[PDB]
Amino acid sequence: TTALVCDNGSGLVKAGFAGDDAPRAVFPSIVGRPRDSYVGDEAQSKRGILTLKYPIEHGIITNWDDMEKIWHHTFYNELRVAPEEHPTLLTEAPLNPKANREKMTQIMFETFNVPAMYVAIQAVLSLYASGRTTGIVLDSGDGVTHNVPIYEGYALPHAIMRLDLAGRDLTDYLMKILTERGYSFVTTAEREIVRDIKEKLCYVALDFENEMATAASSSSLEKSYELPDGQVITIGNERFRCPETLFQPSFIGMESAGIHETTYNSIMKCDIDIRKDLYANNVMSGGTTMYPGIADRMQKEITALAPSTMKIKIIAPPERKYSVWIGGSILASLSTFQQMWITKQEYDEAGPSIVHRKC
Ligand SMILES: CO[C@H]1[C@H](O[C@H]2/C=C/C=C\c3coc(n3)[C@H](C)[C@H](OC)C[C@H](O)/C=C/C=C/C=C\[C@H](C)[C@H]([C@@H](C)[C@@H](O)C[C@H](C)O)OC(=O)\C=C/C=C/C=C\C(C)=C\[C@H]2C)O[C@H](C)[C@@H](O)[C@@H]1OC
Ligand SMILES: Nc1ncnc2c1ncn2[C@@H]1O[C@H](COP(=O)(O)OP(=O)(O)OP(=O)(O)O)[C@@H](O)[C@H]1O
Numbered sequence: 001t002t003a004l005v006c007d008n009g010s011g012l013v014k015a016g017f018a019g020d021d022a023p024r025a026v027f028p029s030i031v032g033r034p035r036d037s038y039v040g041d042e043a044q045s046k047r048g049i050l051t052l053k054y055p056i057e058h059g060i061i062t063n064w065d066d067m068e069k070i071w072h073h074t075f076y077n078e079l080r081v082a083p084e085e086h087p088t089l090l091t092e093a094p095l096n097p098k099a100n101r102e103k104m105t106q107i108m109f110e111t112f113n114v115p116a117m118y119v120a121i122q123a124v125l126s127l128y129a130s131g132r133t134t135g136i137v138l139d140s141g142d143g144v145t146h147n148v149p150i151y152e153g154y155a156l157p158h159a160i161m162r163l164d165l166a167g168r169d170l171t172d173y174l175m176k177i178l179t180e181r182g183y184s185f186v187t188t189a190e191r192e193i194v195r196d197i198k199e200k201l202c203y204v205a206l207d208f209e210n211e212m213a214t215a216a217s218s219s220s221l222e223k224s225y226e227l228p229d230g231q232v233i234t235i236g237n238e239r240f241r242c243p244e245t246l247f248q249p250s251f252i253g254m255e256s257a258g259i260h261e262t263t264y265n266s267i268m269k270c271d272i273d274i275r276k277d278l279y280a281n282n283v284m285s286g287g288t289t290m291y292p293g294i295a296d297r298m299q300k301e302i303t304a305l306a307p308s309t310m311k312i313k314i315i316a317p318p319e320r321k322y323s324v325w326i327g328g329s330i331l332a333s334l335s336t337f338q339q340m341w342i343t344k345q346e347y348d349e350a351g352p353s354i355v356h357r358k359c
């Protein structure tokens with residue numbers, strides 16, 4: 001009886017088997033219909049004849065009919081399993097409405113007929129993936145970035161910070177500053193190349209101006225990238241200006257504070273007797289935390305805001321692109337967890353509202 005772990009994101013579904021150290025399936029959270037329907041890589045493959053939709057926006061499920069197709073495709077096509085023989089752990093955004101929790105639970109028991117399920121908060125799973133139950137997570141993915149302070153397994157809802165700026169916006173920005181330079185990147189196919197360039201050559205500068213100032217006076221920070229058609233292109237200060245937007249959101253016209261400031265604000269919204277612990281346990285998760293140098297930069301920026309009495313420590317494990325999923329694979333593997341599952345029998349007597357009492 002293997003447990004399934006499905007982490008649904010705004011951009012990517014990460015799904016697999018409890019016990020594994022990595023998700024077996026990772027594909028786009030997209031459903032396509034013509035001008036019945038296609039999902040994932042095949043919807044992306046046929047994007048030029050389909051209307052694509054993202055059923056999850058800013059980590060929240062907003063299209064339930066399409067969400068059912070993504071789950072159907074995850075179970076039957078990607079993982080190649082029957083949903084009725086496996087306990088299924090799902091994940092959810094911070095500050096995710098109660099209605100969503102019930103609908104999600106309802107669909108899992110009434111439509112997929114799962115033997116048991118549980119829903120966990122994504123940031124809490126990332127913290128668990130780091131070997132901690134207390135700390136503050138920065139979760140930055142494709143559609144949204146969140147700061148989630150957590151005390152002994154429990155997210156502190158009153159102190160959560162949300163920033164509507166993540167990887168999708170960074171790719172759009174890298175594309176826009178590459179044109180400004182003089183490169184051409186027009187088609188949707190070409191956009192996928194820019195996303196690839198961002199994941200391979202972008203990084204976070206320790207000091208932006210010294211980097212920007214060095215960029216003007218030298219060719220030490222240049223890197224080449226081979227396009228699919230053989231042609232080789234050089235990118236210099238776009239590498240570090242691309243992810244600077246996380247720290248300076250005004251780069252794409254947004255008034256809000258940067259990830260260092262939201263982190264500090266989040267910590268100052270919490271009770272004073274736990275702040276020492278939050279500062280010492282800043283955990284980074286999500287794909288948009290993957291830029292080299294991002295831990296050191298955060299370390300520096302928090303240090304400037306925080307009292308110097310505080311030990312600051314940023315934990316950014318190399319597997320953090322999937323640390324929600326890894327957290328879920330760990331949690332669903334534990335024998336102590338096997339009672340925490342909501343069972344089909346419990347659902348059949350309590351209804352969808354059983355999820356608020358057990359999760
Ligand atoms: C050893 O490998 C085995 C495998 O066993 C293992 C199953 C592993 C499953 C998934 C996995 C996914 O990625 C990894 N491992 C990597 C090794 C990972 O990358 C670096 C390291 C990982 O990120 C380490 C995390 C450490 C977490 C520590 C504490 C947590 C905060 C939990 C917390 C969730 C709990 O407090 C919640 C509460 C109950 O509500 O602490 C806890 O309390 C209780 C337990 C914590 C267990 C942690 C990890 C392991 C290794 C558990 C074995 C069981 O099982 C498969 C089936 C076998 O086949 C393998 O045999 C090869
Ligand atoms: N090595 C990398 N460097 C930079 N960015 C990366 C890297 N790998 C993945 N990303 C980006 O991370 C994003 C996907 O990450 P993730 O799965 O954490 O988000 P999600 O769960 O789909 O979305 P959200 O958490 O916003 O709902 C994509 O925009 C992708 O380009």
Ligand SMILES: [Mg+2]
Nearest residue numbers: 008009010141
């Ligand atoms: Mg996510």
